[PDB]
Design a protein around this ligand. Structure first.
Ligand SMILES: CC(C)c1nn2ccccc2c1C(=O)[C@@H](C)N
Ligand SMILES: [Cl-]
Ligand SMILES: [Cl-]
Ligand SMILES: [Cl-]
Ligand SMILES: [Cl-]
Ligand SMILES: [Cl-]
Ligand SMILES: [Cl-]
Ligand SMILES: [Cl-]
Ligand SMILES: [Cl-]
Ligand SMILES: [Cl-]
Ligand SMILES: [Cl-]
Lengths: 114, 114, 114
């Protein structure tokens, strides 16, 4: 799986250990092996949500399977929870796009998961 | 909806009110409330379009519905128009990927839109 | 086509002409004219792969057609090879998401490719 978070929150406000916490929480939530988890955080971004530039975040979670109605609601609660707790971003100022990737469309180690 | 613009144009060349203009114009174009419109601009990028690093832009517009053949053509005219006017980027050096998202695949406020 | 590389490797480590090499290599691989190839490299990113902060990369390749099982395996070998030789990133620490875009969903020059 791959989780990306883009936010206008400054770098200095992203607490130490955030990438590790995301990796650990996502491994368990998705059920995927920790070695399969990739995380990416992009702070200090120029963005707005509803026209307001108060703290907000635009994210994406890509996974081969483990994507669905119920699972996505659970990931959203988990992720919005972490963003609220660690980056002080209100859950209603966070969007998370979920993508269920076909194995044939994910490259890794000179090949694909197909 | 969510609109992201990645460009090699420097931050100082992004005029005041750009995020606000995009928010307003996209709310009107998509027919969605501006409160639900998120915009993100990423300047000073290392990119090339067609083998040259002259001003260019790689963008994405995600929306639950309001995506289609005719609508996308209309959005492209609007967006390329804004990028040319405000960032001086030639329309033929702009790519905009459109994504019609299923409500279950868009997280927000500890849940999804499903 | 559009190729994006997000990586934690330093900007100073990205060889000059790297964008040009990616452009020409992708033009050859996809069979499409270099004029239509866009490349984007984002260094100095805060990311982790498998919980580790060692060099890694999260990439995407979007193309109208020329995407598939066999082709993607070929693209992965090509791209991982380039990232390894030029950016010193191990292939097993690289993810590449492939997207076969419908022409109606790719905006360009005030319209779409449909
Ligand atoms: C699905 C499988 C190919 C696979 N994907 N993947 C992604 C990141 C790290 C390890 C692996 C991995 C493996 O364990 C191989 C060695 N069997
Ligand atoms: Cl589910
Ligand atoms: Cl897919
Ligand atoms: Cl602005
Ligand atoms: Cl140039
Ligand atoms: Cl339409
Ligand atoms: Cl039309
Ligand atoms: Cl979707
Ligand atoms: Cl194929
Ligand atoms: Cl093959
Ligand atoms: Cl598409």
């Amino acid at each position: 799986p791959m989780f990306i978070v883009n936010t206008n929150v400054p770098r200095a406000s992203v607490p130490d250990g955030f990438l590790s916490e995301l990796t650990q929480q996502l491994a368990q939530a998705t059920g995927k092996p920790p070695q399969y988890i990739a995380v990416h955080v992009v702070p200090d971004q120029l963005m707005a949500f509803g026209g307001s530039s108060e703290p907000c975040a635009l994210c994406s979670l890509h996974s081969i399977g483990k994507i669905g109605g119920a699972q996505n609601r659970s990931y959203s609660k988990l992720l919005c929870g972490l963003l609220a707790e660690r980056l002080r971003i209100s859950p209603d100022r966070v969007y998370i796009n979920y993508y269920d990737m076909n194995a044939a469309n994910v490259g890794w180690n000179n090949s694909t998961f197909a």
